């Protein structure tokens, strides 16, 4: 595929994770955080 | 691509972060999520 859109999702929350603790919202942040942990699994695939 | 050493990397700090949590090693989870950080902007080139 040429569109990448699971790596343009990670980018995204990644930016969003700074943001939420720019806000003061670290309850926010630990939902984002979750939420990069599983797009990780979706882009980083456990491999022979 | 998501096979590089960067991105072996990538999953082995993940990895480690489980790990920590595991151990009630809050303090370590915090330096390997910093790591990742790095990582993560390195495989994507993204900045802050
Ligand atoms: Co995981
Ligand atoms: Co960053």
């Known amino acids: 595929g040429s569109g990448s859109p699971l790596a343009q999702q990670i980018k995204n929350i990644h930016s969003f994770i700074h943001q939420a603790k720019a806000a ?20 980083f695939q456990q491999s022979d």
Request: glycine share 4%.
């Open 24 to 43: 003061g919202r670290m309850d926010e942040v630990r939902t984002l955080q979750e939420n990069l942990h599983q797009l990780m699994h979706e882009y």
